[PDB]
């Protein structure tokens, strides 16, 4: 029997800062126990200061990204070159995904950028369109390895202030872009060690009011 | 057990005459060599219903082709077969060998297996009993054989295929396609079994 | 776990925040209450996408109604638009458990349970989800018509907490809403990790646990 | 990825060090090279508990056999004992082995599959990375290899698996068994996958975790007096 | 069978067990006592597959009674519960396992403490202040998590138990025909005849 | 249906400087239903500690079994069993049930009384030994624990620092698992003193 | 949904400093029967692209016709059909990639794995993969089927990353490809000795080599192998 | 056939003596002298290779035997009985210890296992 | 849903329908009215798959109300029952059939007679003196066979109905939370508020 | 692709050297010609584990036979193979050809297909690739061939079998059994492919 779905592996991570946002993802593409590519970009600049990644089945992921990029183009045509806000993009993607509710895009989608108040924003989607704004979200193969680490090191969960013994929580101080990138790199280094589908390279897209910047880092190739 | 072989003067089609429903021989004098045009014939293997329905449709297409554009090539006939076999591959079980004679191109042979693919060859073998004569046919085939040599090659080859394959048997029918015309040949068990 | 009950001071709506994929906790910050308009609320249980998509869609239908009819849509009509919709998709595999809660002049406070099987039920109390049974225990033993908005809010909060504790697929935090004659009123996000220890100390409950 | 390569005066085997449960890496520095007897070693792929257990059992019985016969054990004895055991269990003991060693008869190299079939060769490979390894062996192997050439070929075949096969990774283990010499076990012969320094230290401030109770655990026995 | 509840208070253990025995589409009996006295100060309620429940209970009963006679001594509830767990843990890997879940309520005369043990058919033992088997816990644990305090009096335990049974009668689909309640304390085992 | 994830639970072990740590959650459930928040999964036989995740009946059974075996070992050998030796005993015991296994994920932790060397080890349900230097994980949230340990862990941590690392590894991993939590215990082990700490965590 | 009948095995390829190389054997298998020994599975498109196809041969022949028709259609009302508006590798790939994903989405796939190798207008090397699922990826080395498991490891020793491409010559690259083809003949039970190889260079253009054979094979050591363990004779 | 001797061949006599054990000790008395001495950093065991014939190669007959890498044995009495005991002693070191604990048994416990085998030959049928 | 009963006496039709609405393990409601008034002198009770029951009932209701307005006339119970049967008979061969069983109780004002029709989801219609759907009939038909006389009063019909409900409450495993009783006679439809 | 052929001076066994796991060639230089006695050998096809285990057991039986009763016949060796293959037919997948040389009986060939039956023949072919050379081998086999003729017959036959069967390949191994002794032959691809 023909199986229209596949698993291309990979792992992605979005973190929302105070006035910036990052969307990271490894560059490894796989089937089963074979590597297809050590560098196959997974996170894309979709215009209007929005970055996107559809992790899981790459064919559905490339299709979705391609269709969203298209939606941005037509949004400009139809509404006098108006900028597509991150919240509006999120809702648009819900409709793209749910449009195929009974033959889903087998992907975990994440987008990142800035909201209309200039603050950092990350939105997370399930395969059939349910979405939610979040401060932190890992997706894909090694998401289970990374998210607990982010609950601990970004939202300071289960962390309290010394001397009080569980009475006073650790205060939720904001993180800089340099601090976030450290957490992203350590997340992917750790994921690479214990997950076979993660490795080769790490590509990070950083979004600020100035635009979209890229950073690349090597990962273990075994 | 079916085969088509090109030679110096043209091409010869050969086939057994057994049709089976399991182990029961439903027809022991079947004619698996069927005519889609004056000098374009085919060898049929697989479902008798599917291959008849296909051959009938092809004959209709080539009759209509002839009325508009004159005599079609053997390549054209093979393309019509392919189009039916390829586009309806999910619902068909047909293994057909197309053979024909032009004056320009002379003898040509095209084989169309299950998938619907086309393969132009010097000679072709197909059917359940073809498996047993891959070795023999490869060793004994030569290009530009005479008519008598080609008849002997087909006769000997199908004789073995019949000998080993239970799905094959009866008489060995042959159809000769040359500039001279169309000749039908038949060879009975007493003749080919003692080979 | 999500509940909704009618009382003297209108309606109380309380939900949890957890979302799972197998044993994996996908999210603890889910919004299972949908603000359809200033007078209507929708609760979400089952498939996240199905509930989200079709309940925000419901809000578009309710808005179109009051544009055409120059009048607020009834809770009965709003609930039936959703139930008639999911009934068209019956068999296709939608998974929704929802309470449509609201207040109008003609109806008063009203709650409808709407279901992906096509079930539409009016009632005073409903609990839906994997942890519904745990919430029902607390509610049924402490429910009265003559409850103060303050006491009713606590009962709903406490009934979710009960389920958050026992049900593995419930938890995270509690979102409270209070629906009155003048519309709904949000009553905060309450983390279970802090609420449990607070309720344990003040109520004297959950003695089986050590703290 | 496990390989075996014959050479001039002996035989060498090698293996990667990755163990996996699904897509997860259970152990990053696993030891897949097992000792059956002092100069008979085997590499194992497949079910980890099985390769270990079946090797230990045959190694135990080989030792007892060596004591009974007053002779050094032979590779064909370990080969025969392994295959008959595996065959008996009809492949359910998921052990896929490359058995090598030196004995009074000479140097030997064999492979064993879970169903009990054995094969002879000058160069062999097994496991999920066997195709990557065999590609290297088929490209670079020749007759009359030296010890230094065989080790190189063997480790290169394992590297092929490490890099190209997701089921293989981390380090390269080697064992060289030369005639008229002690077998040298080279644990972590190559280490081409050390983790880079982390960007941050995640050492917490003391008192960060909330505690309910503390108590001393009595591990000592019942006391006198 | 269906619903079996247990609650350990200050000075006693209270077991409540449904009276219904449904065999298909019919309620055959509405006065069935789903419990056996293992020893003067140890009671075991049970629920699971038909036949297996009683067969297991009486087998355990016999073994404990045999122990009592041999040693002229009553085993502690903890000891009895461990014996029962081992039998079920042995049973789960048998040809045909006992499909029985039990609650063991006992009063330890040595320690002067009530003790409640919940054991499922796999041999999973846990000591609890209050317990249940099957779907009962889904409704009742929220109430117990709320109203139970460890220094409760037997009368307060019975009132809290009534609250549990009322909730079950309201929200459970099956009519379990009320419960038989039994108290286990220092003076032994007695049945509450009005509930 | 899957025996290893009916009851739920987790165990994690770490090595430090002249010390080891082993921790576990306290949950026991029947799938979605939480049943007990006092079901400890760490046991000890002398100075050797054993944590067991998986099916609860087998956890209890194996504990009783290793208590049985270590008690006889001690009577005959006239000394307490060591971590390295116990590890081999656990492997042997599990593999003897190769085609009818106990559905568990054992974790050994302890310090060799003679050499003073810290030791940890993990197993699959049928005996394969994973003797790691750094850390061992087991249970329904093992993926989560792998990610926490791999990022938080650093070698040669002092006992009181190691406590914080393993506690945060367990806590945050359990909070991303539906079948883990409901309390937690952490054992800090030194050559001749052991401290046991119950952790305050969210009860959902 | 179907099942493949007459099939083609590995297609292997790699980039080098001035272009790309691609290769594929000339076999059309019918299950375990090595039925057709003269099948060309490299199909050139213009003088700047070669499409290598594995999997179902009837579907390959269909794709071959789509490409032939594509060239015809591109020439229509196109005075620059042999110049600026000639078909690019990237155009041909994206077309196929669209078709493949559309067909998988109708649950009626073309049962193939395709590698489009070519050189762009600006001299850039093009090498990208697509299959029946519509899955696409690019890499310095690409291979299908068995080639993925055996060829890639050998070819990645030559070009392990992007920076190795300018350092790799056509002689070294061709040598690696030809060696990989030999290895596949040793180890793939559905390979043939005969194969075709194509080079697309930005300077020398398209060089299409037919009727190549695997040579310099090692078999002599087979004589020394006796029995399966204990046998000496 | 079948071993129909399911009863003890060693029994208590009226005086409380176990005759067959006493007679076994008498056989040991006739045997060639062997000895053992324990030092601070080692142990030595020794015996005489009483060659039955000068044509016999006495190197092939080993009176001192390795049981484990750290344990050795020597005897006095009936050589054939010793030989089979060494076989069983070597095997029991593996089956009842090494295959369980992954290490060789301590001297006293291996001795205990050998002792057990010899006791059973004193009581079994 | 679960239990729906009907009984036709001298001058009226009495329909009894359970109040429980159980969804899986919980009883979400205990006051559900499983009936719709199709016309002033025609009542239809219903039971089957969730959603389908109400959807079907309200669809039928709307159609009959439309007929009433168009013709300014009430259809006979026989005519309404035939319309309903045809809809179900159409439904059973649809893509997704209505999984609904109904009882139609009506008083024919022309003939001055009560009429009870039992129709299942297949479109199987029968006119009866007393009827039931699901497992209800298994318990109740024996009582009705015994205590039913065609000249019974409405009060005697209610007493006989109480005896049916008592038997169901005794022997059925499911707690159906009592019944809502409705009487259909010459004066129209009314509900018995105490039962 | 395996075969054994009797000739004037004795018998010759022939085989390919390919072992496959699906389409992966696990071993390309396999020795499928195995020795059960000095001048009794066998050709192995099917499961490599099953055929090795069988051959090892047979070699043991014939070694023990020889120690008691002297050199066994080829018929005896075939009977031992048959007994194992027949009695364990449910659990085995082995197709074996037994060939041996006596001085009294000279060259003999026995084939043992899947079922466990025995067939004494002048020559035998077996294995997946044998199907393709039934026609060739039947046409080209003669009795009392010379050594050189028989080598050519096997070489040509297996060459074709290899050509068409993907499961077959590598080198062609042969073993000659005569009064003179035991001779091993090998033929490489470059030699036999050009035939
Ligand atoms: Cl026909
Ligand atoms: Cl073999
Ligand atoms: Mg025939
Ligand atoms: Mg790798
Ligand atoms: Mg919970
Ligand atoms: Mg009916």
mmCIF file of N, CA and C in Angstrom, chain A residues 28 30 32-33 35 38 149 152-153 158-160 162 165-166 179 182-183 185-186 189-190 193-196 220-222, chain D residues 18 23-26 28 162-167 169-170 193 195-196 198-200 202 204-211:
data_model
loop_
_atom_site.group_PDB
_atom_site.id
_atom_site.type_symbol
_atom_site.label_atom_id
_atom_site.label_comp_id
_atom_site.label_asym_id
_atom_site.label_seq_id
_atom_site.Cartn_x
_atom_site.Cartn_y
_atom_site.Cartn_z
ATOM 1 N N UNK A 28 19.926 19.169 9.071
ATOM 2 C CA UNK A 28 19.976 17.771 8.663
ATOM 3 C C UNK A 28 18.620 17.313 8.129
ATOM 4 N N UNK A 30 16.759 13.672 6.711
ATOM 5 C CA UNK A 30 16.953 12.219 6.781
ATOM 6 C C UNK A 30 15.732 11.420 6.340
ATOM 7 N N UNK A 32 14.669 7.346 7.526
ATOM 8 C CA UNK A 32 15.065 6.152 8.262
ATOM 9 C C UNK A 32 16.441 6.361 8.909
ATOM 10 N N UNK A 33 17.447 5.589 8.494
ATOM 11 C CA UNK A 33 18.788 5.668 9.078
ATOM 12 C C UNK A 33 19.813 6.295 8.128
ATOM 13 N N UNK A 35 21.175 9.727 5.797
ATOM 14 C CA UNK A 35 21.188 11.175 5.681
ATOM 15 C C UNK A 35 20.976 11.528 4.216
ATOM 16 N N UNK A 38 23.177 17.226 4.610
ATOM 17 C CA UNK A 38 23.730 17.793 5.833
ATOM 18 C C UNK A 38 23.387 19.278 5.936
ATOM 19 N N UNK A 149 14.103 21.653 29.240
ATOM 20 C CA UNK A 149 15.260 22.519 29.446
ATOM 21 C C UNK A 149 14.876 23.994 29.348
ATOM 22 N N UNK A 152 12.830 25.192 32.293
ATOM 23 C CA UNK A 152 13.730 25.441 33.405
ATOM 24 C C UNK A 152 14.577 26.695 33.224
ATOM 25 N N UNK A 153 15.155 26.870 32.038
ATOM 26 C CA UNK A 153 16.147 27.932 31.816
ATOM 27 C C UNK A 153 15.608 29.217 31.183
ATOM 28 N N UNK A 158 10.402 25.482 38.615
ATOM 29 C CA UNK A 158 10.963 24.699 39.717
ATOM 30 C C UNK A 158 12.202 25.339 40.362
ATOM 31 N N UNK A 159 12.505 26.577 39.973
ATOM 32 C CA UNK A 159 13.625 27.319 40.531
ATOM 33 C C UNK A 159 13.099 28.317 41.548
ATOM 34 N N UNK A 160 13.728 28.347 42.717
ATOM 35 C CA UNK A 160 13.358 29.276 43.776
ATOM 36 C C UNK A 160 14.585 30.048 44.239
ATOM 37 N N UNK A 162 17.424 31.108 46.855
ATOM 38 C CA UNK A 162 18.134 30.551 48.011
ATOM 39 C C UNK A 162 17.811 31.240 49.336
ATOM 40 N N UNK A 165 13.829 28.716 50.774
ATOM 41 C CA UNK A 165 13.425 27.313 50.657
ATOM 42 C C UNK A 165 11.988 27.138 50.154
ATOM 43 N N UNK A 166 11.808 27.353 48.853
ATOM 44 C CA UNK A 166 10.539 27.080 48.178
ATOM 45 C C UNK A 166 9.442 28.118 48.339
ATOM 46 N N UNK A 179 21.947 35.975 25.192
ATOM 47 C CA UNK A 179 21.623 34.953 26.185
ATOM 48 C C UNK A 179 20.744 33.860 25.578
ATOM 49 N N UNK A 182 22.711 31.500 23.287
ATOM 50 C CA UNK A 182 23.453 30.522 24.078
ATOM 51 C C UNK A 182 22.568 29.333 24.431
ATOM 52 N N UNK A 183 21.343 29.627 24.856
ATOM 53 C CA UNK A 183 20.376 28.593 25.207
ATOM 54 C C UNK A 183 19.954 27.769 23.995
ATOM 55 N N UNK A 185 21.884 27.238 21.255
ATOM 56 C CA UNK A 185 23.034 26.416 20.879
ATOM 57 C C UNK A 185 23.228 25.225 21.813
ATOM 58 N N UNK A 186 23.087 25.455 23.115
ATOM 59 C CA UNK A 186 23.202 24.376 24.099
ATOM 60 C C UNK A 186 22.060 23.371 23.964
ATOM 61 N N UNK A 189 23.008 21.288 20.872
ATOM 62 C CA UNK A 189 24.190 20.478 21.137
ATOM 63 C C UNK A 189 23.780 19.260 21.953
ATOM 64 N N UNK A 190 22.952 19.499 22.965
ATOM 65 C CA UNK A 190 22.418 18.437 23.813
ATOM 66 C C UNK A 190 21.501 17.495 23.040
ATOM 67 N N UNK A 193 23.515 15.129 20.766
ATOM 68 C CA UNK A 193 24.159 14.038 21.496
ATOM 69 C C UNK A 193 23.247 12.827 21.663
ATOM 70 N N UNK A 194 21.976 13.076 21.975
ATOM 71 C CA UNK A 194 21.047 12.008 22.345
ATOM 72 C C UNK A 194 19.956 11.719 21.315
ATOM 73 N N UNK A 195 19.959 12.432 20.191
ATOM 74 C CA UNK A 195 18.988 12.166 19.131
ATOM 75 C C UNK A 195 19.684 12.029 17.781
ATOM 76 N N UNK A 196 19.489 10.872 17.150
ATOM 77 C CA UNK A 196 20.223 10.497 15.936
ATOM 78 C C UNK A 196 19.836 11.316 14.702
ATOM 79 N N UNK A 220 27.582 18.188 15.357
ATOM 80 C CA UNK A 220 28.236 16.902 15.134
ATOM 81 C C UNK A 220 27.580 16.132 13.994
ATOM 82 N N UNK A 221 28.411 15.500 13.171
ATOM 83 C CA UNK A 221 27.967 14.909 11.908
ATOM 84 C C UNK A 221 27.767 13.391 11.968
ATOM 85 N N UNK A 222 27.815 12.822 13.173
ATOM 86 C CA UNK A 222 27.660 11.374 13.351
ATOM 87 C C UNK A 222 26.196 10.970 13.557
ATOM 88 N N UNK D 18 27.971 3.349 19.520
ATOM 89 C CA UNK D 18 26.631 3.898 19.731
ATOM 90 C C UNK D 18 25.598 2.804 19.990
ATOM 91 N N UNK D 23 15.019 6.333 17.984
ATOM 92 C CA UNK D 23 15.834 7.461 17.539
ATOM 93 C C UNK D 23 16.698 8.059 18.654
ATOM 94 N N UNK D 24 16.635 7.474 19.847
ATOM 95 C CA UNK D 24 17.371 7.973 21.002
ATOM 96 C C UNK D 24 18.670 7.202 21.170
ATOM 97 N N UNK D 25 19.701 7.899 21.632
ATOM 98 C CA UNK D 25 20.990 7.291 21.924
ATOM 99 C C UNK D 25 21.022 6.932 23.403
ATOM 100 N N UNK D 26 20.992 5.636 23.701
ATOM 101 C CA UNK D 26 21.003 5.165 25.085
ATOM 102 C C UNK D 26 22.388 5.307 25.702
ATOM 103 N N UNK D 28 26.503 6.511 24.569
ATOM 104 C CA UNK D 28 27.372 7.133 23.572
ATOM 105 C C UNK D 28 28.715 6.422 23.447
ATOM 106 N N UNK D 162 29.934 5.444 11.083
ATOM 107 C CA UNK D 162 29.717 6.517 12.058
ATOM 108 C C UNK D 162 29.069 7.735 11.404
ATOM 109 N N UNK D 163 29.680 8.212 10.322
ATOM 110 C CA UNK D 163 29.255 9.451 9.669
ATOM 111 C C UNK D 163 27.960 9.289 8.871
ATOM 112 N N UNK D 164 27.890 8.243 8.049
ATOM 113 C CA UNK D 164 26.781 8.073 7.101
ATOM 114 C C UNK D 164 25.568 7.299 7.628
ATOM 115 N N UNK D 165 25.755 6.506 8.682
ATOM 116 C CA UNK D 165 24.658 5.734 9.270
ATOM 117 C C UNK D 165 24.232 6.345 10.599
ATOM 118 N N UNK D 166 22.934 6.605 10.735
ATOM 119 C CA UNK D 166 22.385 7.209 11.951
ATOM 120 C C UNK D 166 22.366 6.220 13.116
ATOM 121 N N UNK D 167 22.335 4.928 12.797
ATOM 122 C CA UNK D 167 22.387 3.880 13.812
ATOM 123 C C UNK D 167 23.767 3.701 14.421
ATOM 124 N N UNK D 169 27.662 5.658 15.514
ATOM 125 C CA UNK D 169 28.233 6.932 15.913
ATOM 126 C C UNK D 169 29.311 6.857 16.972
ATOM 127 N N UNK D 170 29.735 8.038 17.416
ATOM 128 C CA UNK D 170 30.710 8.208 18.495
ATOM 129 C C UNK D 170 32.123 7.725 18.130
ATOM 130 N N UNK D 193 34.459 12.468 17.849
ATOM 131 C CA UNK D 193 33.148 13.025 18.180
ATOM 132 C C UNK D 193 33.060 13.536 19.621
ATOM 133 N N UNK D 195 32.247 16.314 22.322
ATOM 134 C CA UNK D 195 31.293 17.413 22.356
ATOM 135 C C UNK D 195 32.031 18.720 22.620
ATOM 136 N N UNK D 196 31.651 19.768 21.896
ATOM 137 C CA UNK D 196 32.246 21.088 22.088
ATOM 138 C C UNK D 196 31.832 21.651 23.444
ATOM 139 N N UNK D 198 30.118 23.824 26.145
ATOM 140 C CA UNK D 198 28.826 24.488 26.188
ATOM 141 C C UNK D 198 29.019 25.988 26.366
ATOM 142 N N UNK D 199 28.042 26.750 25.893
ATOM 143 C CA UNK D 199 28.092 28.206 25.952
ATOM 144 C C UNK D 199 27.923 28.719 27.376
ATOM 145 N N UNK D 200 27.248 27.926 28.203
ATOM 146 C CA UNK D 200 26.806 28.362 29.516
ATOM 147 C C UNK D 200 27.016 27.244 30.535
ATOM 148 N N UNK D 202 25.317 25.502 33.821
ATOM 149 C CA UNK D 202 23.965 25.386 34.364
ATOM 150 C C UNK D 202 23.981 24.927 35.811
ATOM 151 N N UNK D 204 23.453 25.399 39.466
ATOM 152 C CA UNK D 204 22.454 26.216 40.152
ATOM 153 C C UNK D 204 22.995 26.792 41.457
ATOM 154 N N UNK D 205 22.402 27.907 41.922
ATOM 155 C CA UNK D 205 22.645 28.390 43.277
ATOM 156 C C UNK D 205 22.077 27.425 44.309
ATOM 157 N N UNK D 206 22.834 27.155 45.368
ATOM 158 C CA UNK D 206 22.398 26.207 46.388
ATOM 159 C C UNK D 206 21.161 26.739 47.106
ATOM 160 N N UNK D 207 20.151 25.883 47.248
ATOM 161 C CA UNK D 207 18.868 26.276 47.827
ATOM 162 C C UNK D 207 17.826 26.624 46.777
ATOM 163 N N UNK D 208 18.164 26.408 45.506
ATOM 164 C CA UNK D 208 17.252 26.679 44.392
ATOM 165 C C UNK D 208 16.037 25.745 44.396
ATOM 166 N N UNK D 209 16.243 24.490 44.785
ATOM 167 C CA UNK D 209 15.165 23.504 44.801
ATOM 168 C C UNK D 209 14.427 23.524 46.139
ATOM 169 N N UNK D 210 13.100 23.420 46.075
ATOM 170 C CA UNK D 210 12.255 23.395 47.267
ATOM 171 C C UNK D 210 12.233 22.001 47.887
ATOM 172 N N UNK D 211 12.480 21.939 49.194
ATOM 173 C CA UNK D 211 12.563 20.680 49.930
ATOM 174 C C UNK D 211 11.455 20.625 50.977
#
